[PDB]
Structures are given as C-alpha cells and as structure tokens.
Amino acid sequence: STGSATTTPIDSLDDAYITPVQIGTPAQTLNLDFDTGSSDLWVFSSETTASEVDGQTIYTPSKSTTAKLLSGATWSISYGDGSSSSGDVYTDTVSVGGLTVTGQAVESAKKVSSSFTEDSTIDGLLGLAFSTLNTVSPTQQKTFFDNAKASLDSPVFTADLGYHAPGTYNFGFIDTTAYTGSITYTAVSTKQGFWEWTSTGYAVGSGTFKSTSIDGIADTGTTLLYLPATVVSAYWAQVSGAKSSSSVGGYVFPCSATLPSFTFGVGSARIVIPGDYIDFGPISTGSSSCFGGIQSSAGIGINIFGDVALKAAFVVFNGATTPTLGFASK
C-alpha cells in the first residue's frame, strides 16, 4: 500500500505545516502537525477542557463506531518549546492520504497548554519519530508509520515541505519526479529515539564550505534551524546589523536586509537553503527588526534540522531494518 497527502503552511511565515488526517467511522478529519521529532498521535477532542479549546476541530470518539477506549492508558508529553498536553487513549481507524491503519492509538487530550489553545489551525500532532519515545502508559503504543510499515510497498515515508506553499508527505514510495539529481543517504542513530544524523559541514552564502561534523535531528515539528553557536555566529556576521537579542530570544536582523543562503552537507552532497527561507518576519507587528530562521542550539542540548532546513530538500525517512535518511535537492 501507499499514501499521499498534501501538507500546508499554517500561516504566511511557514510557522508549521498541517496535514489532513481521517480518524474514526464515519471519518472525522483533523488537521495534524506531522512531527518527526516525537512519537505520539494526539488530538483535540470532546474530552479537552472546554476553556482550552479555541477554534480547533475536535475528535469525538463517542461518534466513531470503531473507537475503543484503551483501558487504563494515559499519556502526557512536554515539547522542547515548553508546550505540553495530556489525556487518555482510544484505538481507532486512522487514514492519511489513502493509507489506512486499524487499531491506531489516538491519544485524546484532556489538557493542553496555552500555546496549543492559542493556535486554532493545529488540531493535534502525528508523531513520526521512533516508537520508543511514545508516552502512553502503562503500555507504550506504536506510531502511525510503525503500524503501517509492514503493509507499505517500501518501508519509507518522505517529507517535501514547501516554502510559502503546500507540499507533500508520501508513505510507502519515493516520487522520483519530486526532486532533482540523486538522493544522498546518510546513517541514522536511533539511540535517542530521533532521526539523528551527522551533517558533514556548512557554507554561508558564496563562502567556502567548512568540513565539520554536526550531529542533529531531522525534525519536521520544529520551525527553525538550530545549530552550534559558532556556526550561527558565522552566518549572522554576514548580515549587516544582525545581533543576538536576549530580550527577543535569538538573532534578529534588519527587515531591510537581503539574507545570504546557508548550505549544509549530506555526505559529499550539499543542500542550499535560500536566504529568503531564513526570514521569519517582524519580531512584533510593524517592527523593522526581523526574526532569524537560523538560531543557536546552545540552550537545547541537540542540533535541530527543522523546517527551515528540511523545506530546502526532498527528505526520505527510511524505516528499513537499519534506518537511514536521504536528502535530495528539488
């Protein structure tokens, strides 16, 4: 089997991407944030505290003839940005782009933190990291991809995120019309539960490539590109007036600037992020100070190849017995 679904930016800055997902019988369609950095499929629901729902579409398990309460199971998750959610668990039928899993754990939120409430466009998350990170207790549950893998034509999914435009998540096949050149595959460590790999270095604009190993994670659920402070300083030094602002929380730059590109290495191959992809717009409405899309990972503990990086590539998440990642230009 295969599936194919369009993923769409939630706003004009590509702050996140949403993908429609059918849950239950009859189908209830929710727009979920596909997140290769976590492993829980959770939704706003009829059980979510009413004051914490503000415009999201909710899953109502009592209206699904295939929903079954997973007795005794709870979940609770905290994300790197400080947001969180928790609740109980149903199993139900879940379809993405024509690909159907029966018995998928659907984690129904009883509580969500304020940033989720405040984002009316995201109805939940669909985790695509490794199932070892799933938070369901006392019986850990599998991701959608893990449940579908055996049925897929090939045990892979691909992310093709657009810049200020829709893109595509495919399951079970590699669309050879969606990229240029070849796909370069690189080793993955699953020891932390992430799609963790080592970039071979970087360049800033037309500058010379620096060969240096950068361990990090391919994370569709993180908006920006978080890299070591040395790398980030070298980038922003090429932008007149750019500075790190402790009060704003990262590098900012004059909105009048034209940003240089940023290149990262995948083995001997190179992925070029155009300068425009690194502009996240005014820090507050009407400001002439703009927020940068490349930020330091120094306070995270891990480097994160988020959407800023991934949207410049066609990315293969290869879930073969030994997982790997593939990157192509597009």
Side-chain angles (χ1 to χ4, degrees), residues 1-62 64-67 69-109 112-141 143-148 150-190 192-242 244-330:
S1 61
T2 64
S4 183
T6 297
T7 192
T8 302
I10 63 168
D11 63 22
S12 65
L13 298 174
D14 300 348
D15 281 318
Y17 296 78
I18 49 174
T19 308
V21 177
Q22 284 68 52
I23 309 175
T25 308
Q28 299 178 40
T29 298
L30 274 66
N31 296 326
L32 305 189
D33 186 349
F34 281 26
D35 181 13
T36 64
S38 71
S39 308
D40 284 54
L41 192 176
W42 74 262
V43 296
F44 278 79
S45 74
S46 58
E47 301 179 328
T48 310
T49 296
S51 63
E52 295 176 356
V53 184
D54 186 6
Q56 295 81 10
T57 294
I58 63 169
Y59 169 58
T60 304
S62 69
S64 173
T65 60
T66 42
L69 179 70
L70 187 63
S71 183
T74 59
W75 62 280
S76 180
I77 192 163
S78 308
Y79 297 102
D81 64 349
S83 69
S84 64
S85 53
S86 60
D88 56 17
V89 186
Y90 294 82
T91 59
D92 212 337
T93 302
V94 171
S95 300
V96 174
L99 171 65
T100 300
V101 168
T102 60
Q104 174 66 46
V106 177
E107 301 170 36
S108 167
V112 307
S113 66
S114 57
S115 64
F116 286 116
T117 301
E118 289 158 6
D119 184 2
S120 66
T121 70
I122 291 177
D123 303 323
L125 267 65
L126 188 151
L128 294 166
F130 293 89
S131 293
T132 53
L133 294 179
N134 176 265
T135 78
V136 176
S137 180
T139 307
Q140 190 171 60
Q141 300 295 303
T143 70
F144 176 81
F145 177 54
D146 211 342
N147 280 324
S151 301
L152 296 176
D153 291 358
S154 182
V156 306
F157 69 89
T158 65
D160 180 10
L161 303 179
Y163 167 67
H164 296 177
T168 306
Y169 281 103
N170 290 330
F171 291 83
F173 73 104
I174 285 164
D175 179 355
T176 64
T177 74
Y179 56 88
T180 66
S182 61
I183 305 175
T184 296
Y185 289 87
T186 198
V188 163
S189 173
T190 66
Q192 292 189 86
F194 300 121
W195 292 93
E196 188 175 356
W197 65 289
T198 303
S199 172
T200 48
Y202 69 98
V204 175
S206 57
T208 57
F209 187 82
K210 175 74 166 178
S211 294
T212 184
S213 294
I214 305 173
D215 182 288
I217 65 169
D219 185 1
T220 59
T222 290
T223 312
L224 307 184
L225 174 52
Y226 294 90
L227 293 172
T230 50
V231 179
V232 176
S233 182
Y235 178 82
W236 289 109
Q238 296 306 308
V239 180
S240 293
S244 181
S245 168
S246 53
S247 63
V248 177
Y251 279 88
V252 297
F253 67 94
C255 293
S256 60
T258 300
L259 295 176
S261 65
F262 185 89
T263 299
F264 63 94
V266 183
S268 55
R270 306 288 180 253
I271 299 296
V272 180
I273 305 171
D276 285 354
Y277 291 25
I278 299 164
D279 186 347
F280 279 74
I283 63 175
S284 289
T285 305
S287 179
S288 71
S289 184
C290 273
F291 199 67
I294 296 180
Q295 296 293 347
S296 177
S297 65
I300 298 177
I302 200 159
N303 300 305
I304 307 173
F305 294 87
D307 297 334
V308 163
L310 302 182
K311 76 178 66 178
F314 177 89
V315 189
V316 181
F317 293 81
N318 169 28
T321 303
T322 299
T324 65
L325 279 164
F327 293 81
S329 296
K330 65 186 185 193

